[PDB]
Antibody
Framework: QIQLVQSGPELKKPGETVKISCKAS????????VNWVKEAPGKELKWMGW????????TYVDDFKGRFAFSLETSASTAYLEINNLKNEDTATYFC????????????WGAGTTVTVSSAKTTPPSVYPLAPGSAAQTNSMVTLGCLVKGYFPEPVTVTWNSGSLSSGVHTFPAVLQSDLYTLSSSVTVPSSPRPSETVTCNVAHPASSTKVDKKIVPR | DVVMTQIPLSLPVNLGDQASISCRSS???????????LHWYLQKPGQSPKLLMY???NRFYGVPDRFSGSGSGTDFTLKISRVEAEDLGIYFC?????????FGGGTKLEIKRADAAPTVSIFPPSSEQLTSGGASVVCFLNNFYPKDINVKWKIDGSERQNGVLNSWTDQDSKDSTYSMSSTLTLTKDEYERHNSYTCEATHKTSTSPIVKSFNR
């Protein structure tokens, strides 16, 4: 276990700053470069800049100058990236990675530090039930769902009958909708179970200390 | 910047098969020292890249014997030889022959499935939602294959395009299908004043679209 270890995820408001850390252990820190790589949602893996532990000199791909600042506590063997004037577009996962000097590849990658920057305040979700509007079944399964909407920050857990309906469940990835998240699970039961048999949906949103249960009852 | 592009975005494969992701360079990668710095990362879902191949054809410690590497100048190709559960993920091709080292868009290795058509379902605005004045309609397009699918909202006869918010599951590991879900949001008021509401799906398995609806 020779590895680069990085800080946990931050949650900031457009305008504050972050110092992400990357402590290397197991190898001669100064014999390798530390590079910084930025993974934005569905944008290229975007190289940011590199810092030389021997000199101490960073190089920034043009793009990240101005606000992004590499630094180093070599005494303690930890690279750092700092971003200021944080702005919504900086939401991504920053990875640090051991740049080699011979071969120029990146062989040990850090685990990545997700930085989210938003200005929602914490919001518990509204969870509406979705019951099929008289649309009488195609075959033999009936399909219900919970609309978990209006929440920040992620995560939100959704189970059905407290874990006991799992095959059949599909939960869909959260989407923004004016600063807050919206999500939806769907359970597909046999048609002999509903409405003969209770199907209820359980969303817990840890960030606001809330859990609701809704029982899908016909419409 | 040396734009790296790799095609195809997805590659449906059968475990058993050989596969071949291909990748290509805007400028060349033959360096002044006569050397080519094209490397290959593999990134497994929810994880960080792992080096597979450096300098076009040299495997990396540990990575197994199925990963032949190849290409030159400007077209390089990676070929897994008998795919396995183990090597499924996003394959990124990268260049360090120039600076700033740039990354290829990636190629998803996916499992090949007998086509399946979407079992679609439309759901109307819940009472509770309506009693605070917003009306999301919802349409789940479940267990289909391929991932390509086109849901439109025919909203009273005449189609609508605002407020649709689609979300998409990645390949379900039990039955290799995909499932998508579309929520069209509405002001309660607006809802109140329109009758037919039709979620609809253009997808291979029917030359007809699949249409489900509820009249208001």
């Amino acid at each position: 276990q020779i590895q680069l270890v990085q800080s946990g995820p931050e949650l900031k408001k457009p305008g504050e700053t972050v110092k992400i850390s990357c402590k290397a252990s197991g190898y001669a820190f100064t014999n390798y470069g530390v590079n910084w790589v930025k993974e934005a949602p569905g944008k290229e893996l975007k190289w940011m800049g590199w810092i030389n532990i021997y000199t101490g000199e960073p190089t920034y791909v043009d793009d990240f100058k101005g606000r992004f600042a590499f630094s180093l506590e070599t005494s303690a063997s930890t690279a750092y990236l700092e971003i200021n004037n944080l702005k919504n577009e900086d939401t991504a996962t920053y990875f640090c990675t051991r740049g080699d000097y011979v071969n120029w590849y990146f062989d040990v990658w850090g685990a990545g530090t997700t930085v989210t920057v938003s200005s929602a305040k914490t919001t518990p979700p509204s969870v509406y039930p979705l019951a099929p509007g008289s649309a009488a079944q195609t075959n033999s399964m009936v399909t219900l769902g919970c609309l978990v909407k209006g929440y920040f920050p992620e995560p939100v857990t959704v189970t059905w009958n407290s874990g006991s309906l799992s095959s059949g469940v599909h939960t869909f990835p959260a989407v923004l909708q004016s600063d807050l998240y919206t999500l939806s699970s769907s359970v597909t039961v046999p048609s002999s179970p509903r409405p003969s048999e209770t199907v209820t949906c359980n969303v817990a949103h840890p960030a606001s200390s809330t859990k609701v249960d809704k029982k899908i009852v016909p419409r | 910047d040396v734009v790296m592009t790799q095609i195809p975005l997805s590659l449906p494969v059968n475990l058993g098969d050989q596969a071949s992701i291909s990748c290509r360079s805007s400028q060349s990668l033959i360096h002044s020292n006569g050397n080519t710095y094209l490397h290959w990362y593999l990134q497994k879902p929810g994880q960080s890249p792992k080096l597979l191949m450096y300098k076009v054809s040299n495997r990396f410690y540990g990575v197994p014997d199925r990963f032949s590497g190849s290409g030159s100048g400007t077209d390089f190709t990676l070929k897994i030889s008998r795919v396995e559960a183990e090597d499924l993920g996003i394959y990124f091709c990268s260049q360090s022959s120039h600076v700033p080292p740039t990354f290829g868009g990636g190629t998803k290795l996916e499992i090949k499935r007998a086509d399946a058509a979407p079992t679609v379902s439309i759901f109307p605005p819940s009472s509770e939602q309506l009693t605070s004045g917003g009306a999301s309609v919802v349409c789940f397009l479940n267990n289909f294959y391929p991932k390509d699918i086109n849901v439109k909202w025919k909203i009273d006869g005449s189609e609508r395009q605002n407020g649709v918010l689609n979300s998409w599951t990645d390949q379900d590991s039990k039955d290799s299908t995909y499932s998508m879900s579309s929520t069209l949001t509405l002001t309660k008021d607006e809802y109140e004043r329109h009758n037919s509401y039709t979620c609809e799906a253009t997808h291979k398995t029917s030359t007809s679209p699949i249409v489900k609806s509820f009249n208001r």
